[PDB]
Curated annotation (Swiss-Prot):
Described function: Responsible for the cleavages located at the N-terminus of the replicase polyprotein. Participates together with nsp4 in the assembly of virally-induced cytoplasmic double-membrane vesicles necessary for viral replication. Antagonizes innate immune induction of type I interferon by blocking the phosphorylation, dimerization and subsequent nuclear translocation of host IRF3. Also prevents host NF-kappa-B signaling. In addition, PL-PRO possesses a deubiquitinating/deISGylating activity and processes both 'Lys-48'- and 'Lys-63'-linked polyubiquitin chains from cellular substrates.
Catalytic activity: Thiol-dependent hydrolysis of ester, thioester, amide, peptide and isopeptide bonds formed by the C-terminal Gly of ubiquitin (a 76-residue protein attached to proteins as an intracellular targeting signal)
Protein name listed in UniProt: Papain-like protease nsp3
Domain Macro: 1-167
The species this protein was found in: Severe acute respiratory syndrome coronavirus 2
Known outcome of mutating S164L: In strain: Gamma/P.1
Quaternary structure and interacting proteins, as annotated: May form homohexamers. Interacts with N protein.
Regulation of this protein's activity per its record: Inhibited in vitro by GRL-0617.
Membrane topology: Multi-pass membrane protein
Localisation: Host endoplasmic reticulum membrane
Length: 167
């Protein structure tokens, strides 16, 4: 039993809700919140910009030190950093950005990072300003993640389209 509330159950391990991931993290304080990161951990917009803003830019300061030490992530890769005031940890995961011409096949590799964590609050990878089809992202999530994932979806038309179309 966990403290996530109001989610629709899609499968044995995947749950979905129309929600703002920032406000959800602040309420639940999950062990792991997933960020929709880029390889430079430059948290400008989308989920990343919103999470970072909620940390008063502490996420960005920590991220800049991470990059200075380790260099950029790989597309499809991840790193674990602090969750600041939002969660114990933040798993920064890089899905392919179709608006950069990156390979959508890397979306499965990106979701594989979730399997290293028993429970996660997450967005749909490569959706929104990353330019992939969210219905596709949900399908890859369900077919790749085996740990317990609570998916937040900010928009309502999306969310309703994702639910109604789920196979
Ligand atoms: O709503 C659309 C999608 O879900 C993803 C892609 C674009 C933003 N977005 C978010 N999901 C969840 N929480 C969020 N907070 C702020 C943004 C956000
Ligand atoms: Cl985004």
């Amino acid at each position: 039993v966990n403290s996530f509330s109001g989610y629709l159950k899609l499968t044995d391990n995947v749950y979905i809700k129309n929600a703002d991931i920032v406000e959800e993290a602040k309420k639940v304080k999950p062990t792991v919140v997933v960020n929709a990161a880029n390889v430079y951990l430059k948290h400008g917009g989308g989920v990343a910009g919103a999470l970072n803003k909620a940390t008063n830019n502490a996420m960005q300061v920590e991220s800049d030190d991470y990059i200075a030490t380790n260099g950029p992530l790989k597309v499809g890769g991840s790193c674990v950093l602090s969750g600041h005031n939002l969660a114990k940890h933040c798993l920064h995961v890089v899905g392919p950005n179709v608006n950069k011409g990156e390979d959508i096949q890397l979306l499965k590799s990106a979701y594989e990072n979730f399997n290293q964590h028993e429970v996660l609050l997450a967005p749909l990878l490569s959706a929104g300003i990353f330019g992939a089809d969210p219905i596709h992202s949900l399908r890859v999530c369900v077919d790749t993640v085996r740990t317990n994932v609570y998916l937040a979806v900010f928009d309502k038309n999306l969310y309703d389209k994702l639910v109604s179309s789920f196979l």
